Amino acid sequence: STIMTDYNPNYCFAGKTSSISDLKEVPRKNITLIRGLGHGAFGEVYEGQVSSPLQVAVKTLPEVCSEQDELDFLMEALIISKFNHQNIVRCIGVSLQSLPRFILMELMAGRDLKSFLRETRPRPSQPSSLAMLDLLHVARDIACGCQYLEENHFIHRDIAARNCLLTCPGPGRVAKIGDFGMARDIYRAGCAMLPVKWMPPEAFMEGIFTSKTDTWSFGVLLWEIFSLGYMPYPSKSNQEVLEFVTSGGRMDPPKNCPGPVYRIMTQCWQHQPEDRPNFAIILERIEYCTQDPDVINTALPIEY
Ligand SMILES: CCn1nc(Cl)c2c1-c1cnc(N)c(c1)O[C@H](C)c1cc(F)ccc1-c1nn(C)cc1C2
Question: Active site: which residues?
C-alpha cells in the first residue's frame, strides 16, 4: 500500500484524528463475493459475506488506478468508519492489504432510494404499495442523518436520492445516507459532474459550503421523494437550472404534494442561507406533517 503508506493522510471528524491504522482490517480469507450489483463511477460493487455470516456490500478499488484514486478510496474508508448514527450506513471494515482493495458496508436490502421510489410507485398491480406516511418516514430518516452531520460540523455536499439506501423494501424500512464521495473529493482538494440541480446559489457561484448547503440539497431530495423518483427540474439542463435558480426560479410541487410538505421545500430553497431552516427545524416540520390527517390521507398518484 505504498501510496496510502507514504502519504498516510490524517482524517479529522468531530475534532478526532484517525488514520489508515484505525480502520478494521478484515482478513481477506473471511470475505466471499456473492454477486455483482453493477458499478458506480469508479470500481465495482458486490453483495458479499464476512465470517450466520455478516451480509455486506463490497465496494472495490480497480487495480488499474491512479495515486489519487488510492487516496480517494482511503479517505472514503476513514469518513464512513468514523460516523456512528442509525441513519448513516455502517462500515463493517476494509480489506486494504489485498488486491483489489475492499470497503465493507452494511448490505441495504431495500437498495438505493431513487430505484426504490421508481419501482415501488403505486400502480394497478399494487394500489397501496406506498402512502404519504412512508414518504414522510424516509424524509425524517434522512433529515435525522443530516442533523447528526450538522451537529458534528460535517457538510455532505450531495444530499440526493441516488446517495440514500433503504434497509428493506417493505414496512419497517429505514432510510440512510449511503455515499460520501463528494465530501471525500473536497477533503482531498469539472462542472459537468457537479450535482448543480442539488446546489444552492452560493455553492455553484462562490464555492461556499456550510450546513445550509445541505438544507438546500435536502429540499431537492424532498422533491425527489414526493415526486416518487423524478429527476429534479424536469426538461432543464445544468446551465438552465443554474440560470433559473440564480434568478429566483423554484420547482413546482410534485403531483398531489400536500401544501405543508411543499412549504418545507420552499423554506429549504430560500436564496439567503440564513433564511433556510437548520435540520432541527426541518425535523420538527416533518414531524408536524406526519401528525396532520390532511397530509397523510392524501392519495399518491397511481402510475398507469
Ligand atoms: C441490495 C444490494 N444493492 N442493490 C442495489 Cl441496486 C444497491 C445495493 C446496495 C446495498 N447496500 C449498499 N451498502 C450498497 C448498495 O452500497 C453502494 C456503494 C451504494 C451506495 C449508495 F449510497 C447508493 C447506491 C449504491 C449502489 N451502487 N450500486 C452499483 C448499486 C447500489 C444500490
Answer: 158
